[PDB]
Symmetry: D2
C-alpha cells in the first residue's frame, strides 16, 4: 500500500545523532505541530542515512523544518512507539 | 502552527466499529494495514463526523481504502500505573476518505 | 477521486489580489520549486479566507507551504492553464 | 530547495501509450480522471521501472494511485504562439499503485 506522512513543525530539542559501526548516522528529533484556543501535537521523527547527517547538523531547537516519511510502530522494552521514519524514500527541507 | 498530514492506502483489518455519541455524532474506529516488501504496518484510524457514518456503512474487513488525516497521540496510564501512548490517524472534516476498487 | 498538490517554494512576484462579483477575495501568485538548478514555476490561486491572508502576508521572495487541487481552466484568448487551487479544502502556511 | 508533490486517485481515460527512447527506457503516457459534480482531467507520464508497469497492467477505465511532481513544458504551436502543458511526472522519485 501507501504509507505517507508530511509534517511541517518546530524541532523541540537538539537532535540526537548516534552512529552505527557500519558508519551510518541515525538522528532522532521531536517535532511540534499545532492547530488553532490552541493544541500542540508532538511527533517522534527518526532520520536515517544522509538526511540524518543533514538533520543532525542543520537542525536546532526551534528550527522550522519540513519532513516527509513513513509511519512505523516499533515494539521495545512492552511499550510501543509510532515513529515517523525519514530515509532515502523520504524527504526533509529546512525552513 | 504547522502541517500534520497522513495519507494511507491499505486494507481494512476488521469490520468497523461505530459509536454514536449522546449528541448524535458518530465515531468509527478501524485498523488499516499497509505493506512494503513483506513488512505490514498496522495503523489505528478513527473517523469523526460525516466520514464516520460513511466509513461505518461502507468499510468492511478487507476493504481497500484511501485515508487522509492527521496524527494524534493519546496518553493514558495503564493498569500497572505506567504511562502509555497510542498514536492514531484522525480523519475528520479536515481529512478525506475514498472507497477503492 | 483524489486530487492533491503540496508545494513548498518561494513567491515569484507580489500577490495580485482581486475580488469576484461575490466580493470573494482571490489571490494569484507564482511559486517556484527547484529540483536537483531546474526551477518549476507553479500558478497558484487562493480563495476565501486564505486569499485574504496570502495578499496580507506574502511578498516577493517569501517561502510558502501550499496545499490544494489541480484545476485546468479553459480560455480562448482555445487554450488551457493548469492551476493549484487553494480554497477551503486546502491549506497554506507562511514559512520563514 | 522546495517541495513539488502531487497525489492522485482516479481512472485512466485511455489505453496507456508506451514508448521507448534510444536508451530503450520506457515512457508511458495516460490521462487520469479525478472527480467529486466536476471531472478534472490530468496528463500523467511514467518513466523508468514504473513506466513498464503502467503499460502492462493499466487499461481504459482502471483506478490507480499515482504520486509524482508537476512539470509544465513550453512549446510553440503551429502558430509560432507559445503554449503550455502541465503534466504529472511519475519516475523513480514517484509512486504508483494499481487498485482493486
Ligand atoms: O471545512 C473544512 C476545513 O476548514 C478544512 C481545513 C483543514 C485544515 C486546514 O489547515 C485548513 O485551513 C482548512 O479542510 C476541509 C476539508 C474538507 O474536505 C472539507 C471541509 O469542509 C474542510
Amino acid at each position: 500500500g501507501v504509507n505517507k506522512v508530511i509534517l511541517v513543525g518546530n524541532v523541540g530539542g537538539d537532535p540526537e545523532t548516534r552512529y552505527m559501526p557500519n558508519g551510518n548516522a541515525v538522528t532522532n528529533i521531536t517535532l511540534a505541530t499545532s492547530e488553532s484556543q490552541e493544541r500542540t501535537e508532538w511527533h517522534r521523527v527518526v532520520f536515517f542515512g544522509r538526511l540524518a547527517e543533514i538533520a543532525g547538523e542543520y537542525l536546532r531547537k526551534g528550527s522550522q523544518v519540513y519532513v516527509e516519511g513513513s509511519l512505523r510502530t516499533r515494539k521495545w522494552q512492552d511499550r510501543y512507539t509510532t515513529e515517523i521514519v525519514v530515509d532515502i524514500n523520504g524527504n526533509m527541507q529546512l525552513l
